[PDB]
Amino acid sequence: VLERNETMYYGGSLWSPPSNWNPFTPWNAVPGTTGLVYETMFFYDPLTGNFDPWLAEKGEWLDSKTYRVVLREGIYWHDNVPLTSEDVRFTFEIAKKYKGIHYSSVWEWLDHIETPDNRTVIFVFKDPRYHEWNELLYTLPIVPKHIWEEKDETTILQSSNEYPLGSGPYVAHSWDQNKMIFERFENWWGTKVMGVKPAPKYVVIVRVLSNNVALGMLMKGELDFSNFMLPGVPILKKVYNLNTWYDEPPYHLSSTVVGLFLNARKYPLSLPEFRRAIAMSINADPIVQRVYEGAVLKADPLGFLPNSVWMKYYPKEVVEKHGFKYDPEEAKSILDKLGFRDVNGDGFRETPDGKPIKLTIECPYGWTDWMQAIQVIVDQLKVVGINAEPYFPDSSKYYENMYKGEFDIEMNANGTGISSTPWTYFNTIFYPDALESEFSYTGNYGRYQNPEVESLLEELNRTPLDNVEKVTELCGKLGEILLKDLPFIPLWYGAMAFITQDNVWTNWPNEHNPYAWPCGWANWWQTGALKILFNLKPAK
């Protein structure tokens, strides 16, 4: 039983029973495990693009192939063991020893690590992949050598890591099927050194069956910090005093690229020209206008987030010449040309060989906005003679399907989140290593194959970010492939849905006090939601 006034209720990113706290398995780890319990070398702030020293006191390129971080002094694990450069060293090297660890690939371009003292980590690279390194700096959680030292690979990969031993502001406290509770670690080093202190003694991650349940909670004042997508925002504000980031439409910040992955290995979705017909048959205007009531922004064909630093590298002419539009008559014309015609007379087009075509289109149950969006896509596909069947599995099955590539059509925003480089977006789309993976956690979920994308991805990755002309050119070349082969169809920019109320906690960020990115998704707490905790004030 938790004291209400000492407790902040968060919801929006827990859609399965909390059952994993393993920093090595971020796809299964309960939201907050990284960020609240395990710490990263840097914070990252999507509002500004700034990296802010967390564990790292500083991080610099000494030269084009050498990166050095100097840790802050006085960092400790929760069990009072000093956190040192060897902890950081270990974090990387355990993956060279055990290649099954998802980030073992870094050693294909990381040559070795030096630690001239216990605060200093020096990375020397065989092949410096800058864009990817930048992201590692704020996404790779640092783990305790003295805890994991003598575990084998199966233990590391398969353990649940209950009551994870970290260095961060919180510990795991308790949980059940419907919530995860974090309790503030009072002797946190972060407070002694950085002078910050997360205001709630307890953070509860609330799991809910569907978005509609969360709204009732908010109206009852039982959620404080909500990332659920909820309708009727003007009314929520006026009638129920629930607040959003912006006072006016679109009300929410934009955080992701929402679109459709297609199974590139299942006929007829294996056909580029069929994928194109699908893209041209979909009109997002009623999704944007009616499902979201103007609370999201519609995507252009390339799908670069308008509020992101990717725009700095926008390949404008490529999009103009190769982008698609909603054009259902041309979609039908393409389908006729390919031989996809109705031969039994039920209004659906068959294969040229005369065989029926039925494609499932799926999203998680309870994501009410995507379920509605999926049905308008279904109705829009029906009208060009394409039989799409909506399917809303449990979130856990939705993600298993995604990783395994066991889907026909799939609504997706997994890895397309805002970032410091358009490389994340293209990697999520094209991720070549998916073709030789049972489980693809990184992207390319529909197993799209292309002989030139891997080289393009790498060339982009090793191009210094300040080389605008070259990064732009490479985004152009990659965008050109995306636009012509459409393995992923961008539709709109997902809202960073963020609704709060002030009955228990106040001083939330918004457009008038825009101090932190409000995202409590797994792996996102170090992008701002932790900083919000630092800044919250109890209500009077």
Ligand SMILES: OC[C@H]1O[C@@H](O[C@H]2[C@H](O)[C@H](O)[C@H](O[C@H]3[C@H](O)[C@H](O)[C@H](O[C@H]4[C@H](O)[C@H](O)[C@H](O[C@H]5[C@H](O)[C@H](O)[C@@H](O[C@H]6[C@H](O)[C@H](O)[C@@H](O)O[C@@H]6CO)O[C@@H]5CO)O[C@@H]4CO)O[C@@H]3CO)O[C@@H]2CO)[C@@H](O)[C@@H](O)[C@@H]1O
């Ligand atoms: O509106 C619908 C519905 O929305 C809900 O809110 C959703 C929202 O819609 C999104 O769907 C969101 O999705 C999140 C997701 O929950 C999770 O937080 C996700 O984390 C990403 C990271 O952002 C990052 O991209 C990460 O990439 C890693 C990768 O997966 C590998 O693990 C890792 O290993 C690499 C290695 O480092 C090498 O660099 C590389 O070459 O290969 C290795 C492995 O091959 O590499 C990176 C670094 O770790 O992946 C994770 C997991 O994908 O981010 C997405 C957003 O992009 O979820 C929200 C919460 O559910 C709610 O609002 C509903 O109410 C609403 O109805």
Ligand SMILES: [Mg+2]
């Ligand atoms: Mg037919």
